[PDB]
Design an enzyme around this catalytic site. Structure first.
Site, PDB file in Angstrom:
ATOM      1  N   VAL A  27       0.697  -1.272   0.115  1.00  0.00           N
ATOM      2  CA  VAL A  27       0.082   0.234  -0.061  1.00  0.00           C
ATOM      3  C   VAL A  27       0.863   1.359  -0.109  1.00  0.00           C
ATOM      4  CG1 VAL A  27      -2.130  -1.162   0.783  1.00  0.00           C
ATOM      5  CG2 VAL A  27      -0.306  -0.428   2.320  1.00  0.00           C
ATOM      6  N   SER A  30       8.137  -0.361   4.622  1.00  0.00           N
ATOM      7  CA  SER A  30       7.210  -0.936   3.795  1.00  0.00           C
ATOM      8  C   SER A  30       6.036  -1.597   4.582  1.00  0.00           C
ATOM      9  CB  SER A  30       7.781  -1.950   2.957  1.00  0.00           C
ATOM     10  OG  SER A  30       8.445  -2.777   3.755  1.00  0.00           O
ATOM     11  N   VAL A  31       4.681  -1.167   3.825  1.00  0.00           N
ATOM     12  CA  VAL A  31       3.508  -1.614   4.529  1.00  0.00           C
ATOM     13  C   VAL A  31       2.637  -2.510   3.564  1.00  0.00           C
ATOM     14  CG1 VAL A  31       1.443  -0.919   5.885  1.00  0.00           C
ATOM     15  CG2 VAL A  31       3.514   0.677   5.757  1.00  0.00           C
ATOM     16  N   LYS A  46       3.176  -3.261   8.921  1.00  0.00           N
ATOM     17  CA  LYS A  46       4.327  -2.432   8.671  1.00  0.00           C
ATOM     18  C   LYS A  46       5.514  -3.150   8.964  1.00  0.00           C
ATOM     19  CE  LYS A  46       5.580   1.953   9.889  1.00  0.00           C
ATOM     20  NZ  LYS A  46       6.269   3.166  10.959  1.00  0.00           N
ATOM     21  N   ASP A 161       0.765   8.790  13.799  1.00  0.00           N
ATOM     22  CA  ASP A 161       1.910   9.619  13.666  1.00  0.00           C
ATOM     23  C   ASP A 161       2.834   8.981  12.534  1.00  0.00           C
ATOM     24  OD1 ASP A 161       4.512  11.207  15.490  1.00  0.00           O
ATOM     25  OD2 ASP A 161       3.848  11.723  13.614  1.00  0.00           O
TER      26      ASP A 161
HETATM   27  C1  LIG Z   1       0.701   7.468  19.528  1.00  0.00           C
HETATM   28  C2  LIG Z   1       1.414   8.475  18.774  1.00  0.00           C
HETATM   29  C3  LIG Z   1       0.421   9.350  17.765  1.00  0.00           C
HETATM   30  C4  LIG Z   1       1.967   9.375  19.598  1.00  0.00           C
HETATM   31  C5  LIG Z   1       2.348   7.765  17.651  1.00  0.00           C
HETATM   32  C6  LIG Z   1       1.906   6.887  16.943  1.00  0.00           C
HETATM   33  C7  LIG Z   1       3.066   6.433  16.169  1.00  0.00           C
HETATM   34  N1  LIG Z   1       3.354   5.624  15.388  1.00  0.00           N
HETATM   35  C8  LIG Z   1       2.590   5.831  14.176  1.00  0.00           C
HETATM   36  O1  LIG Z   1       1.664   6.676  14.279  1.00  0.00           O
HETATM   37  N2  LIG Z   1       2.812   4.955  13.188  1.00  0.00           N
HETATM   38  C9  LIG Z   1       2.117   4.853  11.938  1.00  0.00           C
HETATM   39  N3  LIG Z   1       2.822   4.449  10.706  1.00  0.00           N
HETATM   40  C10 LIG Z   1       2.165   4.666   9.667  1.00  0.00           C
HETATM   41  C11 LIG Z   1       2.696   4.193   8.333  1.00  0.00           C
HETATM   42  C12 LIG Z   1       2.835   2.616   8.304  1.00  0.00           C
HETATM   43  O2  LIG Z   1       1.593   1.920   8.363  1.00  0.00           O
HETATM   44  C13 LIG Z   1       0.855   2.001   9.686  1.00  0.00           C
HETATM   45  C14 LIG Z   1       1.043   0.931  10.651  1.00  0.00           C
HETATM   46  C15 LIG Z   1       0.835  -0.540  10.284  1.00  0.00           C
HETATM   47  C16 LIG Z   1       1.069  -1.437  11.277  1.00  0.00           C
HETATM   48  C17 LIG Z   1       1.407  -0.854  12.679  1.00  0.00           C
HETATM   49  C18 LIG Z   1       1.444   0.338  12.916  1.00  0.00           C
HETATM   50  C19 LIG Z   1       1.018   1.260  11.797  1.00  0.00           C
HETATM   51  C20 LIG Z   1       0.993   5.102   9.728  1.00  0.00           C
HETATM   52  S1  LIG Z   1       0.765   5.451  11.405  1.00  0.00           S
HETATM   53  N4  LIG Z   1       4.173   7.219  16.766  1.00  0.00           N
HETATM   54  C21 LIG Z   1       5.347   7.011  16.499  1.00  0.00           C
HETATM   55  C22 LIG Z   1       6.292   6.779  17.537  1.00  0.00           C
HETATM   56  C23 LIG Z   1       7.477   6.661  17.198  1.00  0.00           C
HETATM   57  C24 LIG Z   1       8.098   6.925  16.097  1.00  0.00           C
HETATM   58  C25 LIG Z   1       9.488   6.824  15.645  1.00  0.00           C
HETATM   59  C26 LIG Z   1      10.394   8.113  15.852  1.00  0.00           C
HETATM   60  O3  LIG Z   1      10.403   8.487  17.164  1.00  0.00           O
HETATM   61  O4  LIG Z   1      10.794   8.871  14.792  1.00  0.00           O
HETATM   62  C27 LIG Z   1       7.235   7.204  14.933  1.00  0.00           C
HETATM   63  C28 LIG Z   1       5.890   7.311  15.267  1.00  0.00           C
HETATM   64  N5  LIG Z   1       3.778   7.785  17.983  1.00  0.00           N
END
Ligand SMILES: CC(C)(C)c1cc(NC(=O)Nc2nc(CCOCc3ccccc3)cs2)n(-c2ccc(CC(=O)O)cc2)n1
Ligand SMILES: CCCCCCCCO[C@@H]1O[C@H](CO)[C@@H](O)[C@H](O)[C@H]1O
Length: 334
Positions: A27, A30-31, A46, A161
């Site tokens: 999608v 990689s996801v 992911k 995020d």
């Molecule tokens: C809880 C809240 C909003 C603070 C939060 C939520 C997230 N994480 C997050 O949004 N992940 C996502 N990833 C995608 C794209 C991938 O497909 C989805 C997917 C597939 C499977 C499983 C999960 C996601 C969409 S949403 N972080 C977060 C914490 C640390 C870091 C690392 C750093 O520090 O760089 C980055 C983000 N903080």
């Protein structure tokens, strides 16, 4: 017991996922979208890109896993599973994370279009319900914008995020103030809300200065109370060197909008962050009378930021991450 895995190549990369997850389709980076058969949910999986290549990548891998393990709330993204094909730390080299596949983001749901007052209420109510949780954990999102807002067909919403953007950031973040509080998210919501009601980006800046030029036109130039709080000499000197702006009357900005929604915007889009409404406070605001429930707006066990901000060797992050994977308890089934 350890599940049986299966190997499939997708998107210039080999994927080793358990039998549970079926019809994997890419999608974007990689996801993969997939069907989970144990639960019956469509799921996004992911694969963590080059997890332990550098100290940063590794430190970044651990942060995400931990944070998401701790995030357990309906309006915040969570983990349905986390897995590795590794049978031992010494062969451990890849990490996969799983959550409900989600339909669209807040642009895709409906953005260009003017949502109805009742609908805006539900969405903003949810963001705020999620923000209460994240905030109680001492976390600040720092990047709330619609592309970070996952929403199904029923319009149930989860904050996420993804690791134009500058349209939703609090003024202090643009001015690279480097102490800020949770209300930088409240600004973002303020902007997001203004948009939902009008169909119009509140602050559609072309660059950084234009962005702040626009924000000031609505909220007014900083008062003598706010003027007193600017640390940097040069910065103060510049704020004096501006022509005085009056706070625009929100009523005239949001013509015919429900004045309950106006009062709420009045309380979010306040230049001085110390006086912005808190997520908790906003849920109490009359605007969400039809949705607010004080017995079901829960908080989080507090979260250790200091554990993710450390000078650790590669192998030390790799092992702390592995432990988290091993220690993972799935959420109880539906
Ligand atoms: C809880 C809240 C909003 C603070 C939060 C939520 C997230 N994480 C997050 O949004 N992940 C996502 N990833 C995608 C794209 C991938 O497909 C989805 C997917 C597939 C499977 C499983 C999960 C996601 C969409 S949403 N972080 C977060 C914490 C640390 C870091 C690392 C750093 O520090 O760089 C980055 C983000 N903080
Ligand atoms: C163009 C000038 C606008 C200045 C916008 C920044 C003012 C935001 O408000 C400030 O936020 C800081 C960071 O959270 C706090 O430390 C201060 O107490 C608060 O006054």
């Amino acid at each position: 017991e350890r599940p049986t895995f299966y190997r499939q190549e997708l998107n210039k990369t080999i994927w080793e996922v358990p039998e549970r997850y079926q019809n994997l389709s890419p999608v974007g980076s990689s996801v993969c979208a997939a069907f989970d058969t144990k639960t019956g949910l469509r799921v996004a999986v992911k694969k963590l890109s080059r997890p332990f290549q550098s100290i940063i990548h590794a430190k970044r891998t651990y942060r995400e896993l931990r944070l998401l393990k701790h995030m357990k709330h309906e309006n915040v993204i969570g983990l349905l599973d986390v897995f590795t094909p590794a049978r031992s730390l010494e062969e451990f080299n890849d990490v996969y994370l799983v959550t409900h596949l989600m339909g669209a983001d807040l642009n895709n749901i409906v953005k260009s279009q003017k949502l109805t007052d009742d609908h805006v209420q539900f969405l903003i109510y949810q963001i705020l319900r999620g923000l209460k949780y994240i905030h109680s954990a001492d976390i600040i999102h720092r990047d709330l914008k619609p592309s970070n807002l996952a929403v199904n067909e029923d319009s149930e919403l989860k904050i996420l995020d993804f690791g134009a953007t500058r349209w939703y950031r609090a003024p202090e973040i643009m001015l690279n103030w480097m102490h800020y509080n949770q209300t930088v998210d409240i600004w973002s919501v303020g902007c997001i809300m203004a948009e939902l009601l009008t169909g119009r980006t509140l602050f559609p800046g072309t660059d950084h200065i234009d962005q702040l030029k626009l924000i000031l036109r609505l909220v007014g130039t900083p008062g003598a109370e706010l003027l007193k709080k600017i640390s940097s000499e040069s910065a103060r000197n510049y704020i004096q060197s501006l022509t005085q702006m009056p706070k625009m009357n929100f009523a005239n900005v949001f013509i015919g909008a429900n004045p309950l929604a106006v009062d709420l915007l009045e309380k979010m889009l306040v230049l001085d962050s110390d006086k912005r409404i808190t997520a908790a406070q906003a849920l109490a605001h009359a605007y969400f009378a039809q949705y607010h429930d004080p017995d079901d707006e829960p908080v989080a066990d507090p979260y250790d930021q200091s554990l993710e901000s450390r000078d650790l060797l590669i192998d030390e992050w790799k092992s702390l991450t592995y432990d988290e994977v091993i220690s993972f308890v799935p959420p109880p089934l539906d």
